[PDB]
Amino acid sequence: PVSMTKTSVDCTMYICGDSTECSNLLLQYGSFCTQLNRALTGIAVEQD
Amino acid sequence: ALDPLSETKCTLKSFTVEKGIYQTSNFRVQPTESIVRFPNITNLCPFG
Numbered sequence: 001p002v003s004m005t006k007t008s009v010d011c012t013m014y015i016c017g018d019s020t021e022c023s024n025l026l027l028q029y030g031s032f033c034t035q036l037n038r039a040l041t042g043i044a045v046e047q048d
Numbered sequence: 049a050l051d052p053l054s055e056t057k058c059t060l061k062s063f064t065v066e067k068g069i070y071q072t073s074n075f076r077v078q079p080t081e082s083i084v085r086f087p088n089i090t091n092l093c094p095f096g
Binding site for chain 2: 013
């Protein structure tokens, strides 16, 4: 094996199905998802 | 939100932005109209 499917999952669209209030509750948890997205971005560019 | 450079500067949390490609925000198409549906039925009330 050399490569895997380069996938990226969005913070809000995955966690909350386009609810602004649900987004606000998610933003209370802080930088979880943006670090999650950054780690998966690191994987994506890493694979290339 | 001034220009694509400025979204990069804010997401990076740095005024200087070095060489590369940066994900800042997520594009989205906002729902424009709305539709609500329910099946037509022949069960008219015989009250008349």
